[PDB]
Amino acid sequence: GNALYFKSARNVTVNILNDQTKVLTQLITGPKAVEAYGKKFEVKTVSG
Amino acid sequence: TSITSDIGMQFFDPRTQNILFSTDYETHEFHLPSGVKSLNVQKASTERITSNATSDLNIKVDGRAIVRGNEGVFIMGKTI
Amino acid sequence: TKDGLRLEGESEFLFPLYAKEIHSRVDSSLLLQSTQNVTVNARNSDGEVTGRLKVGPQMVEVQSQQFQINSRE
Ligand SMILES: *[C@@H]1O[C@H](CO)[C@@H](O[C@@H]2O[C@H](CO)[C@@H](O[C@@H]3O[C@H](CO)[C@@H](O)[C@H](O)[C@@H]3O)[C@H](O)[C@H]2NC(C)=O)[C@H](O)[C@H]1NC(C)=O
Ligand SMILES: *[C@@H]1O[C@H](CO)[C@@H](O[C@@H]2O[C@H](CO)[C@@H](O[C@@H]3O[C@H](CO)[C@@H](O)[C@H](O)[C@@H]3O)[C@H](O)[C@H]2NC(C)=O)[C@H](O)[C@H]1NC(C)=O
Ligand SMILES: *[C@@H]1O[C@H](CO)[C@@H](O[C@@H]2O[C@H](CO)[C@@H](O[C@@H]3O[C@H](CO)[C@@H](O)[C@H](O)[C@@H]3O)[C@H](O)[C@H]2NC(C)=O)[C@H](O)[C@H]1NC(C)=O
């Protein structure tokens, strides 16, 4: 019955850190560009 | 950075309201992107294959080459 | 606790939340779900939401002026 949100006045820099706190994949939703850094990308369907 | 759904990925610039990229292929037709080095398509309908004015075409294949001329073949060249 | 405070219960915030860094536990994977949709938003200096990463009921939408993909380098 409600929509969970995430907001900010700036970038939302979703990232992942290894045990050494080093970035491996990143997803930065900024004001102008939505970057998806990483080692890959995929889009699958339900059946695979 | 995996994604998953029944329909798929989407993106449209809100300053045009035009779907700049989608993955429901039946609806929006795919177009060739710019800056492509090679493309490996499993079936091609090519009217003509030609090189540029510098180097040689090389129809090279590890598999077998089966060229079939339904109305006939014509080989024109200097040293054949 | 001494260095922090551990909570094992459903901390329903009946009013908004604010923070700077939202983490997940080391031994458990963060999950975030709903029934209608989940929205990530980002705003300009005038508060105008300009880049949206929306996971709608059926299929994802990204709304922005650009959509890059790079490697780690
Ligand atoms: C994603 O989830 C949210 C929350 O369920 C959806 O927002 C909801 O949208 C409907 C359709 O507009 C709202 O109903 C009506 O909204 C107008 C304001 O535009 C209001 O004046 C009416 O009285 C009526 O409530 C609904 O309120 C709104 N919910 C919330 C919490 O704001 C949204 O539509 C969902 N996305 C999609 C693509 O469906
Ligand atoms: C929030 O997100 C935006 C969009 O991704 C970031 O803007 C971009 O940030 C990068 C890195 O700061 C900029 O690259 C820079 O390019 C200049 C040359 O133009 C170079 O000299 C720098 O060393 C750097 O590589 C990029 O230009 C910039 N693009 C735009 C459109 O703003 C922004 O940095 C992010 N901010 C934060 C705090 O994460
Ligand atoms: C006409 O076709 C020939 C044959 O492909 C082209 O020559 C080749 O052009 C490519 C791309 O321009 C060259 O690749 C790059 O070359 C640079 C230096 O030349 C090298 O440092 C890079 O690592 C990369 O290999 C390629 O070397 C070049 N080969 C030869 C023998 O010239 C030519 O550019 C085409 N001309 C036009 C107008 O289309």
CA of C42 to the centre of ligand 1 (A): 19
Distance CA B41, CA C64 (A): 31
Could you tell me the two tokens for B30? Answer: 């795919």
Contact by Cβ (8 Å): A26, A13: yes
Contact residues on chain B for C61, CB-CB shorter than 8 A: 10-12
Instruction: Compare all CA atoms of chain A with the CA of C40 and give the residue at the minimum distance.
Output: A6
- Separation of CA A22 from chain center: 15
**E strands present in chain B:** 10-13, 18-22
Q: Is the CB of B17 under 6 A from ligand 3?
A: no
Question: What technique solved it?
Answer: cryo-EM
Contact by Cβ (8 Å): B7, C58: yes
C38-43 and A4-6 as β-strands: parallel, antiparallel, unpaired? parallel
Token pair 């970035």 in the structure block, residue:
A23
Token pair 């045009």 in the structure block, residue:
B16
Contacts of A8 (CB under 8 A, 6+ apart): C41, C42, C43
Q: Determine how many CB atoms are found less than 10 A away from the CB of residue B72.
A: 5
Q: Closest Cα to atom 26, ligand 1: which residue? A: A2
Could you tell me the two tokens for A34? Answer: 């939505």
Contact by Cβ (8 Å): A16, C49: no
Question: Could you tell me if C62 lies within 8 Å of chain A, comparing CB atoms?
Answer: yes
Could you tell me the two tokens for C44? Answer: 């300009």
B18-22 and B10-13 as β-strands: parallel, antiparallel, unpaired? antiparallel
Closest by Cβ to B1, choosing from A27, A45, A46 = A27
Let me know if C64 is exposed, middle or buried by CB neighbors in 10 A (0-12, 13-18, 19+): buried
Distance CA B60, CA B58 (A): 5
DSSP code of residue C3:
S
CB atoms B9 and A27 under 8 Å: no
Token pair 């002026």 in the structure block, residue:
C65
**C residues 26-55 near A, CB within 8 Å?**
32, 34-45, 47, 49-53
Token pair 């079936």 in the structure block, residue:
B43
State this model's resolution in angstroms: 4.3
